[PDB]
């Protein structure tokens, strides 16, 4: 596989079982924040990591549960980090379920009974503040035509427009019709840096979880899991409100069962930006992660063929843009789960380490 700057298990099964990665860069700290659902998905946990150039290494501190991250009898669950530039502050979007809850029965039950919650930081990821139930003002009416509905998982986006907008992708199970609910992605919106919500139109039918990113002219990109073999892509021009074009991209695999959630990022373009998308490349099964690129985005034709990333039985994976790397090349910090969910791993490489024919 693919030569990396770093490769080190940030979580593992012990006492508990760990899934759902997310991470977050923070640029003028030169420090990493590692998230992921510590299940018996109960809570929330995390691990800061400061990342020194000079030794190509990130120095991973203790894990700590981010004890506001949680509604009082509720699971906690679907971490989705962001970092608003503009005001400082720290996001940690997250969806709340009651105890006496479990998954399938959210699917297919007719009854929502799912919460959006968010708490912030002021300290990059120290302290945070107490959660805040976004429920009825993000999501309305709508909210009874759901079975459920969940965020990211992953990180977020903030987009370069005016209001610096917050965007965090997401999906809903909605009963349309003597069948089961179907899911649709969508991004919830807010153009006053968190203070108010509001929910984006649905891309096309059948399309799970996903993440979003900015290219250059402001075009928001979406790539979404699907029920097909392939991934779906859909882009909006007027900053997530719509997601007008839609289509599978048969270039991005999906694992047979259910599919599997995937990662994206823009970045600078060395030659104005290209994104990484990193996913498992294994046609029949969630094994081998991969990397792709695209240097002419959102062109669906334009993702390249996957690099190799990690050989084995590899899941949900996030990415970050680190900035500049060692060797000059961008630098990317990627997390995913591997061995059967048994751990998470963090994964550090260069745009030169991995697509040495485009840099
Ligand atoms: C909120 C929640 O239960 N998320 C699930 C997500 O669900 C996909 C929709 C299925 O119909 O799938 C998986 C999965 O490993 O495949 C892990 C997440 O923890």
């Keep these: 596989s693919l030569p990396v700057l770093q490769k080190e298990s940030v979580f593992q099964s012990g006492a508990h079982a760990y899934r ?6 923070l640029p003028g700290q030169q420090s990493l924040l590692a998230f992921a659902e510590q299940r018996a998905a109960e809570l929330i946990v995390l691990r800061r990591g400061d990342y020194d150039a000079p030794t ?10 981010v004890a506001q991250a949680r509604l009082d009898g509720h699971r906690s669950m679907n971490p989705c ?37 968010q708490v912030t930081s002021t300290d990059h990821g120290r302290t945070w503040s107490s959660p805040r139930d976004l429920t009825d003002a993000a999501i309305g009416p709508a909210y009874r035509e759901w079975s459920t509905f969940a965020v990211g998982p992953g990180h977020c986006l903030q987009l370069n427009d005016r209001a610096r907008s917050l965007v ?3 999906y809903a199970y909605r009963k349309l019709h003597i069948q089961r609910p179907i899911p649709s992605a969508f991004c919830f919106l807010s153009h006053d840096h968190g203070r108010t919500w509001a929910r984006g139109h649905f891309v096309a039918q059948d399309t799970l979880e996903c993440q979003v990113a900015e290219v250059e002219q402001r075009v928001v990109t979406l790539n979404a899991r699907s029920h097909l073999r392939a991934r779906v892509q859909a882009q909006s021009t007027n900053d997530g409100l719509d997601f007008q074009e839609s289509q599978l991209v048969k270039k991005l695999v999906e694992p047979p069962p259910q599919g599997c959630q995937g ?23 969630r094994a081998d992660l991969g990397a792709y690129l695209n240097p002419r985005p959102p062109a669906p034709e334009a993702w390249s063929e996957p690099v190799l990333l990690a050989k084995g039985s590899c899941a949900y994976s996030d990415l970050q843009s680190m900035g500049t790397g060692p060797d000059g090349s961008p630098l990317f910090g990627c997390l995913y789960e591997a061995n059967d969910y048994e751990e998470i791993v963090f994964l550090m490489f260069t745009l030169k380490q991995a697509f040495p024919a485009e840099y």
């Design 20 to 25: 759902i990665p997310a991470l977050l860069y």
């Design 81 to 117: 980090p962001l970092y608003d530039a503009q005001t400082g502050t720290l996001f940690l979007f997250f969806i709340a379920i009651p105890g006496q809850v479990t998954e399938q029965q959210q699917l297919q039950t007719r009854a929502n009974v799912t919460r959006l919650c």
């Design 168 to 170: 965090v992708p997401a």
């Design 56 to 65: 190509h290494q990130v120095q991973w501190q203790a894990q700590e549960v």
């Design 263 to 285: 990662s994206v990022i823009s970045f600078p373009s060395p030659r104005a930006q290209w994104l990484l998308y990193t996913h498992p490349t294994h046609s029949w099964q």
